[PDB]
Design a protein around this ligand. Structure first.
Ligand SMILES: [Zn+2]
Length: 312
């Protein structure tokens, strides 16, 4: 309890039918023991996370002053080591503290609480999964996280807490290691940086025994997820909850998808994939209701959001 408050204070085998109802019944069967969620930006839009693709907002205004050689440079490790300022100016905007987890995030928290969540693979860097209660062990953050930070020197790797980093960034002080003076950066996985070994190992193990895949707030044709979805055993049901199904646009990926076990919701061969088109929060609300978890989710969201306001 006090630990939860300190945590927040510092921060701030098949379906009967191919329908959401069918998935809910499957989830209540004894065969559904391991669930993997693959999530993208769509699960955080209701929290107020902006569309990072638009220069519209004042998000990148502070950056049009450092003159980056190419867009990806702000997340490239060799560039960071020579010019850390741009990334830290952007991180000031991205660090957690201004947003609360959504209904969708707390739904995954329930899966955790109930012993159903094997793993949550996320493309986001808003830290909302962790704020919602998911622990490192439950997560494969494709692009890393701002929650942990480490000295960039391979011979050092000293770790630093969120409050240590948070203070520096808001004070606009470039974080330096206290042991070796090298730069310290949040554990966002930069181009040219190796990701934790755990990522590959989870990707190679988790889909062998998964009983259900919940894909939310992301297109199926996204670099990481495209491959993971086809790794699950052939009998594993897969549910997509997103506002719209993405269109084609690219022959190789498309063909590889059709030949490798990609989602099949509508063909004559469809047998285990379900698409539920609408807002992620609405979809999790719908699913929770079918499972008899409406009130529990309700109280969870209300209570966690209130703890965040209270801080303490
Ligand atoms: Zn160091």
């Amino acid at each position: 309890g006090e630990a939860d408050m300190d945590f927040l204070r510092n921060l701030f085998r098949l379906l009967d039918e191919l329908t959401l109802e069918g998935v809910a019944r499957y989830m209540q069967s004894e065969r559904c023991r391991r669930v993997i969620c693959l999530v993208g930006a769509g699960i955080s839009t209701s929290a107020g996370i902006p569309d990072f693709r638009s220069p519209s907002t004042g998000l990148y205004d502070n950056l049009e002053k450092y003159h980056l050689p190419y867009p990806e440079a702000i997340f490239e490790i060799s560039y960071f080591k020579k010019h850390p300022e741009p990334f830290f100016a952007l991180a000031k905007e991205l660090y957690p503290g201004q947003f609360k987890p959504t209904i969708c995030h707390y739904f995954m928290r329930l899966l955790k609480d109930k012993g159903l969540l094997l793993r949550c693979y996320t493309q986001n860097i808003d830290t909302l999964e962790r704020i919602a209660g998911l622990e490192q062990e439950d997560l494969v953050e494709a692009h890393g996280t701002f929650y942990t930070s480490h000295c960039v020197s391979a011979s050092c790797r000293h770790e630093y807490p969120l409050s240590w980093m948070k203070e520096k960034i808001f004070s606009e002080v470039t974080p330096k290691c206290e042991d070796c003076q090298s730069l310290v950066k949040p554990d966002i996985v930069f181009f040219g940086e190796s990701l934790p070994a755990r990522f590959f190992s989870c990707m190679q193990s988790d889909f062998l025994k998964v009983d259900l895949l919940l894909v939310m707030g992301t297109s199926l044709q996204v670099q990481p997820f495209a491959s993971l979805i086809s790794k699950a055993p052939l009998s594993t049901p897969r549910l997509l909850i997103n506002k719209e199904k993405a269109g084609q646009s690219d022959p190789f990926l498309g063909m590889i998808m059709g030949l490798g076990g990609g989602m099949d919701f509508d063909s004559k061969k469809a047998y285990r994939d379900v698409a539920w088109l609408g807002e992620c929060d609405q979809g999790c609300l719908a699913l929770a209701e079918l499972l008899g978890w409406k009130k529990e989710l309700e109280d969870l969201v209300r209570r966690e959001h209130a703890s965040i306001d209270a801080q303490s």
